[PDB]
Amino acid sequence: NDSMYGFIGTDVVLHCSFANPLPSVKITQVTWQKSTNGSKQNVAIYNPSMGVSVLAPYRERVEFLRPSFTDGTIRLSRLELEDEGVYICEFATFPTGNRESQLNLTVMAKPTNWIEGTQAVLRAKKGQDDKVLVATCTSANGKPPSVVSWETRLKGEAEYQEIRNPNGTVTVISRYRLVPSREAHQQSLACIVNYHMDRFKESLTLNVQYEPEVTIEGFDGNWYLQRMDVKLTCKADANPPATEYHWTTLNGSLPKGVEAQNRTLFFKGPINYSLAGTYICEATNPIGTRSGQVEVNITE
Amino acid sequence: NDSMYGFIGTDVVLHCSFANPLPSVKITQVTWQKSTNGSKQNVAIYNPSMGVSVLAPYRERVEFLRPSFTDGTIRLSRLELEDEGVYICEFATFPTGNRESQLNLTVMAKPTNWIEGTQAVLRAKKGQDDKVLVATCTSANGKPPSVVSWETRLKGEAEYQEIRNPNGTVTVISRYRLVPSREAHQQSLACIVNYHMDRFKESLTLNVQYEPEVTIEGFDGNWYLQRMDVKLTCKADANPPATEYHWTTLNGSLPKGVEAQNRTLFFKGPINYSLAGTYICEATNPIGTRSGQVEVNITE
């Protein structure tokens, strides 16, 4: 049998006509019923002798379009989720008896879609390989369920959940998880939901806090004897930024003539051989502490 | 819903009445249909304005008993196996619509019952422990199936088979088997078939052929010296009867003064000690050969 589909709030026309009417055969009455599937309840009746009858609760939403001996077609207005079910149309005739046809009514609903990030702060620490939630994509109260997916360059794993609501709509939820990293920071994650031929997209960017990646600038390989005023600068790539800096060497402390001031190691000069060595910067932010090195050799 | 049952050839009354008729509600038409279970075909229609309509193939077997605005009751006459199925009765009314009720029709049939023996000859031989068929009890073309069982003092095993006929009747067959024996001969075997509260019984007696059970009569323990005219008689219980008799002794042949003539060993006399010994009769029938013994001691 036929299947009709319509969205909540719209109207459907349910066709029902009597094929080959004969001079012999006479149409007595045309009857629409709804089977909520054992239960038959009467919806609307058309009797040529007595006119039209639409029963509650359909009195304001149902109507015959062109009620006649041959046409029992009706419009069901302002669809409701509960309109779903099987509809039977019956022509009672004499002396030949009953002729019935059936159809299925499915009611459809467009979902409400939205992405959301975690309220938690994302942290990237070595030794932390824990995958965590970074975003949730929801398609709520749709029918049939929509398809949810993700667009991103991030390398994570998505989990999917489908909730069957009491009213027959389905909520689809996807949860995106990854182990937070320095490279993930500021990067984008989009959730995509496909319903029929519609396509919804919403994006967000990740905020990921990570310990310092430190490098040392300043040594140009031309630190010649007697040169004046050279310095090393500790570059701490850190989110949030480093709060604290500490300089040391591989063999002990700093030499006389080398002064530390936060991220800078000043070599006032004149440069001499006793300044060669390996200089280390230890940088600290709220996430952790990391070191960086530079090997200084004195030239000329 | 209701279930009706009737035997082939009988009539059933299928009830259908409209409960609480109101001044408001008006009955348009009463319709009987048969659902052979997807298919609805029209059986009979009653329309107050236009009268009665019974459709083929029901024109001579269906009739409304008291056709009115409230009563759609019909008689289905001379039941046929194919009448089985679901019957729907529908009151079309205005402005309230359709009211239907259903019922199941099951058609019943009494079986034809009979016992029968094997055409084979039953044989009892030592070393033959083969169970064989001795009787078959059939209950043919019944609906529902009848219960088949056996009454007998014999110690055998019954096998049961149920054949589902194309028309929906069931044939029940039971096969009785036993290893044939001398004691089974002439003994009775009855098959019993219960249908509803009826009880059918039919008996037969077994004919079993067996080799000879031989005993020796004639020695009275008073075979005193010089006694004249005594004899031994070989009694062969055999079916069919023994055809042949042979006498011998444990130690050789017969003594002078002892003459054999079929089942008789004549001791003419006078009796003397040389006549003591063990005398054997070997009796043969179409089934086998068996021996019998008697120890003769001479007295006084």
Swiss-Prot record, chains A, B:
Domain of life: Eukaryota
Any one biological process term the GO annotation gives: regulation of synapse assembly
Glycosylation sites: N1, N37, N104, N167, N251, N262, N272, N297
Post-translational modification: (Microbial infection) Ubiquitinated by CBL following infection by herpes simplex virus 1/HHV-1 and association with HHV-1 envelope glycoprotein D, leading to its removal from cell surface.
Effect seen on changing N42A: Decreased interaction with herpes simplex virus 1/HHV-1, herpes simplex virus 2/HHV-2 and pseudorabies virus glycoprotein D, leading to decreased cell fusion with the virus
Keywords in alphabetical order: Cell adhesion, Cell junction, Cell membrane, Cell projection, Disease variant, Disulfide bond, Ectodermal dysplasia, Glycoprotein, Host cell receptor for virus entry, Host-virus interaction, Immunoglobulin domain, Membrane, Phosphoprotein, Receptor, Repeat, Secreted, Signal, Synapse, Transmembrane, Transmembrane helix, Ubl conjugation
Gene Ontology terms for molecular function: carbohydrate binding; cell adhesion mediator activity; cell adhesion molecule binding; coreceptor activity; identical protein binding; protein homodimerization activity; protein-containing complex binding; virion binding
Protein name as catalogued: Nectin-1
Domain notes per entry: The Ig-like V-type domain is involved in homophilic interaction in cis, a prerequisite for cell adhesion. Ig-like C2-type 2 mediates neurite outgrowth through binding, induction of phosphorylation, and activation of FGFR.
Residues covered by the Ig-like C2-type domain: 114-203, 212-299
Extracellular side: 1-300
Effect of Q29A: Does not affect interaction with herpes simplex virus 1/HHV-1 and herpes simplex virus 2/HHV-2 glycoprotein D
Disulfide bonds: C16-C89, C137-C191, C234-C281
Phenotype when changing T28A: Does not affect interaction with herpes simplex virus 1/HHV-1 and herpes simplex virus 2/HHV-2 glycoprotein D
Reported impact of S49Y: Impairs interaction with herpes simplex glycoprotein D. Decreases susceptibility to infection by herpes simplex virus
Gene: NECTIN1
Disease affiliated with this protein: Ectodermal dysplasia, Margarita Island type: An autosomal recessive form of ectodermal dysplasia, a heterogeneous group of disorders due to abnormal development of two or more ectodermal structures. It is a syndrome characterized by the association of cleft lip/palate, ectodermal dysplasia (sparse short and dry scalp hair, sparse eyebrows and eyelashes), and partial syndactyly of the fingers and/or toes. Two thirds of the patients do not manifest oral cleft but present with abnormal teeth and nails.
UniProt topology in membrane: Single-pass type I membrane protein
Ig-like V-type domain residues: 1-106
Assigned GO CC terms: adherens junction; apical junction complex; cell-cell contact zone; dendrite; extracellular region; growth cone membrane; hippocampal mossy fiber to CA3 synapse; membrane
Mutation effect (N47Y): Impairs interaction with herpes simplex glycoprotein D. Decreases susceptibility to infection by herpes simplex virus
Main location: membrane
Protein family membership: Belongs to the nectin family.
Range covered out of full length: 36 to 335 of 517
Subcellular location: Cell membrane; Cell junction, Adherens junction; Presynaptic cell membrane
